[PDB]
């Protein structure tokens, strides 16, 4: 069938029009290997989305696929017992690999992993409130926590990556805080920002939890945590089993050991093949030179993309880690037009602006993507000269601050509005009706 | 290479929940399995009656499922940059043909996420706040609290304990605020007509009726309770759908499923392809003439044999329910567990909660092996435990059956003063609440 035939069938039976069809490039992938994907009509594309970050090593990685198919064929997938040899071997590998990991438990998705981390922190501490920055998943309490402010029905206070807010909240009501959970943003902030958050949480005996579902294999081979940010819990997900569904919650023994009293559970958390896959992923990441070559390819792409935009006179900022770099533009229309056009030249850029190379990339794959980006940017500007400034200027500080707030809820200004919002939120928490709490297990109430 | 004692010690150090993973289950760990049989770390063999905690419907390492999943992984790929794939569309088309309620179908990784999705879509499609619930839907706090009769304002969930008198009164009192009714069908204490009456009440108040068939979907019948003839606006499937590979599905009325865009639901691994290939293979097996009928015959053989073993020892008992999910109810909550722990020694994993789950891979030899183990274990426990093993015959008391239903699944089956006052108290709590205080919803309703 071709694209048009498949989407007509999909519209009738399964597809969400925007999420599945009109918000995405007009192709459907049939197979993929290494850096390259092939659509239903045989057209080939370099992938820069990492399969929405699920893939770190490349498509159909041979050692990962050998390990997963061996488990499926020779032993089985999901057994009557919850422990298995691969689960224990993987847990041992992770506890040896990561400083925070004294025990580790597994789930299917990052959304459920961060929910489990919050559930365990509440059960281990007996406290009600959670302070949050960043995206943690699609449940309502997670999405609301991306916005600055307090939701009494969920027990979550969003703090917008704001250090002044975090310190003021912990001083005001830190005895009520079960945990601080943060998806580290490392374009606008350096590692010291997160070291200060962590040390500040420790001063108040509040667990600090890094949501590394996205950054865990892309800020570095051991994530932001492994770059030297102490934490009591780290959640991993994207990349862990190189596209197979697996998430992990690793951390302090007493937090993980709250599993029994928490009531957490789940039929498929014992599923064995993804655990075999993750063991193979760690073996690749720990092979001398492999991660460094991936970062070299990321730098080659980032440097070339920055050069292309600057040569067109387009204000831009290209930054962040090599395996998860952002391309920040003067407005939210230019990027989408370029990336849509680059699909015509054989590339799937990440249209949210964070480009994701994988370990299978070579210089030829990077340079194919750069050719498409140069040609697409040229065509877009030729056809729509007013789509963005072309005067050679820099991104304004106003655009950078506005982008941070719109993209990830970061409140980076020290102005009247931000200061008033901090005070309003702290007052709302401190003087609330304490008889009204979220539904919690165990109950606190 | 490592035995049970070594594995549990290594696990306690790095991963195990002491009760959930170790002390609360049989003292063996499964290394590999095929069909109805599992083998532990030391080579001992067991017939599985847990269905891998219901994940498995056909049997372990079923050749058609193994072929479909490995072919997709090996020859094409696992998760791609596009969310649509050929197997997703083919699976959606198969399910839309198979099920009356399925106009569209979306997929997720776990049944807990599937039922959460169903509620999110019902609220998004209707613009209404409250959900009425009966039965277990997953491990999130709002799901767990909804198993108890009553109202939690912070979640917007009212548990109604399977009670039709409560359901009708709630819909009359505040049905204009109800986005959906979500029920896990219990078919030991209730018949299909009970669920048809729930569905009819929901239809009269324009409230979506949603069947959580994460457990019952392939075990109440080959098309679940819905396929036996209970109308629904949404059905959630999960256990068995991909024969042990993680996959869940939310299928239902077009306008409810089409709330996906505005709801904010996402989740990356929802596009993962191999489990969808596996589910296509599962439907093909279930639709093969004789396969499901043979599985039900094996379940009847097991249930009939377990009933006569207990009755032969004079233990009052009730063995009933569908052949692929029958309950063994005893006079107290200790006796079954003690028999099942003892039966492990004789080469069976019985389901400790009492709902025994055969799979399509069962044959008479597997059933009879389990019955022989059950007969020996029952004899041993009866002899050793007169404190929990009455041998004086008779039936379960009416009080025991009523208490078991409330404890096991939150069913409020009594028509008495305490139950009626609880119904009225809960309705007054909902109706008289501070309407300015409500759960966080997306899309927002405040
Ligand atoms: C699947 N959720 C898994 C949990 C844990 C263990 C599993 N065996 C299952 O057990 C539930 C029992 O099934 C249930 O018993 C009641 O329902 C079945 C039956 C035969 O009708 C019984 N008759 C007396 C009745 O008591 C217990 N009340 C509750 C137990 N937890 O549930 C699941 C999900 C989550 O899927 P996932 O995230 O993939 O694990 C969501 N919804 C449902 C309906 C189920 O079963
Ligand atoms: C400017 N710098 C940016 C910065 O703006 C910021 O951008 C993020 C995006 O990254 C994020 O989504 C990106 O990842 C996916 C979804 N989340 C998985 C996920 C899950 C649940 O896991 P599961 O249930 O298995 O899906 C849990 N926790 C985390 C941390 C997860 O990432 C798919 C879509 C893809 N675009 C957006 N959803 C929001 C947007 N604010 O963060 C990255 C950055 C580079 O720092
Ligand atoms: Cl295509
Ligand atoms: Cl299997
Ligand atoms: Cl914010
Ligand atoms: Cl063992």
Automatic annotation (TrEMBL), chain B:
Domain of life of the native organism: Bacteria
List of residues binding pyridoxal 5'-phosphate: 111-112, 268
Residues bearing the modification N6-(pyridoxal phosphate)lysine (covalent): 239
Name used for this protein in its record: C-6' aminotransferase
Gene3D superfamilies to which the protein is assigned, alphabetical: Aspartate Aminotransferase, domain 1, Type I PLP-dependent aspartate aminotransferase-like (Major domain)
Family: Belongs to the class-III pyridoxal-phosphate-dependent aminotransferase family.
Cofactor(s), by name: pyridoxal 5'-phosphate
A Pfam family: Aminotran_3
Transferase among keywords: yes
One Gene Ontology term of the molecular function aspect: transaminase activity
Keywords for this protein: Aminotransferase, Pyridoxal phosphate, Transferase
